[PDB]
Amino acid sequence: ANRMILNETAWFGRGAVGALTDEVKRRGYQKALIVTDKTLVQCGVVAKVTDKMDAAGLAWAIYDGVVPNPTITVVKEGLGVFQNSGADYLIAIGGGSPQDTCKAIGIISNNPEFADVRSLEGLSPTNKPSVPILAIPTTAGTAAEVTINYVITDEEKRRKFVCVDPHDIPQVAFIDADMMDGMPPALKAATGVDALTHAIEGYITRGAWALTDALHIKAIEIIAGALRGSVAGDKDAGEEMALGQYVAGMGISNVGLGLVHGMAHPLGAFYNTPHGVANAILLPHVMRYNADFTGEKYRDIARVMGVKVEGMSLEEARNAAVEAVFALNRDVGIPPHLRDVGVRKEDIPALAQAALDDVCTGGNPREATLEDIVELYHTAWTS
């Protein structure tokens, strides 16, 4: 049998954060800890929520210490603010980094044996649900609001580790493009291809089945349709991307991903490479590597990405799918090679071993060897 974990409640569309004060009142919560970063405070994005909470008379404290690729230290610091704040629920405002920190704080607060953070790695043996989380994405996006995953950086051991726990699922997600409009174009581009990576890896993952196939192929269609227009500053394209990135996530934790995420995690751990940039550069190379193990699925991908596939052979469709992703990456200004974003040739042996042992790599339709992963990093590194 196949399990699907989703948000019990989700609000979609421009103005969705306007639903938050009535959700809090109906749930009888007394005090929020807002988990976010300094940039979202500075840019007035957090104020779009706190101004509504102030007018409704709802108490909140804030922790804005989250950094990209959030660390054990960031989790322990936010846990300290939660405990000393007396909050009874959490509001995650931001991208994957704040939403992942928020999941870690919520789990540990109701399962305090995990306050070391490291022991959460894998299928966390937690007894209690997380503190209730209201999730508000500001990128489009990681779909952190709908997955049961969170990823923490172990600075000491130079590795990203994945915590997988049904207990961490947010009670409500608010998917509001108003919260996302302030993304610089380069951030729309990188988080957008992260979302496309989730959709493509999900579609072809080993555990794929009828319902996840329907959700993931629709996500690819929405994202391929909207991402260029969103990067160019189009308002409606922004709202499409906000939905597209969510739908892409409805499969990540439920069926899995593959070698793109497996090879991206070690780059974040070694270099603090932005997750979306790493995925975008690797995606088309891993798609080429996987092509022979995906049945007819690359014809579907090609088709919804605007390729005329009618009258192409399977081989021609498979090449057209890979080229369509190369083309998207060029159109939205993603660098084409790993050397361009600060990777070192000398690190590839270590990167490959980390990638081979990453949990995401298990879902890859073609079984990956150390030798194959070394060769793929080399193929992605330079001209």
What residues make contact with Fe ion under the rule CB under 5 A? 194
Residues in region 223-262 near its own copies by CB under 8 A: 240, 243, 247
The residues near 271 (Cβ < 8 Å, ≥ 6 apart) are 341, 342, 343
CA distance 325 to 8: 33
Please compute, for residue 197, the number of CA atoms within 13 A of its CA located in the half-sphere on the CB side: 33
Q: Residue 30 interacts with its own copies (CB under 8 A)?
A: no
139 is in an annotated binding site: yes
69 is in an annotated binding site: yes
Question: What does 276 interact with, of ligand NAI, its own copies, Fe ion, none (CB < 5 to 8 A by kind)?
Answer: ligand NAI
Cis omega (within 30 of 0) for bond into 141: yes
Pick the binder of its own copies from 30, 54, 157, 209 (CB under 8 A). 209
290 is in an annotated binding site: no
Paired strand residues for 37: 65
- CB-nearer residue toward ligand NAI: 39 or 73: 39
Q: How wide is the angle at C-alpha 368 spanned by C-alphas 276 and 345, nearest 5°? A: 60
Phi, psi of 334 (to 5 degrees): -75, 130
Three-state SS for 198? helix
Q: Which amino acid is at 236?
A: D
- CB-nearer residue toward ligand NAI: 194 or 291: 194
Question: What does 55 interact with, of ligand NAI, its own copies, Fe ion, none (CB < 5 to 8 A by kind)?
Answer: none
383 is in an annotated binding site: no
| CA-based nearest residue to 43, from 182, 174, 185 | 182
Pick the binder of its own copies from 32, 33, 46, 169 (CB under 8 A). 169
Paired strand residues for 135: 92, 173
- CB-nearer residue toward ligand NAI: 14 or 31: 14
Question: What does 80 interact with, of its own copies, ligand NAI, Fe ion, none (CB < 5 to 8 A by kind)?
Answer: none
Handedness of CA 123, 200, 242, 215 (dihedral sign): negative
Q: Give the annotated binding-site residues for Fe cation.
A: 194, 198, 261, 275
Q: Give the annotated binding-site residues for NAD(+).
A: 37, 69, 96-97, 138-142, 149, 160, 179-183
Contact residues for its own copies (CB under 8 A)?
1-16, 18-19, 166, 169, 176, 209-211, 214-215, 218, 222, 240, 243, 247
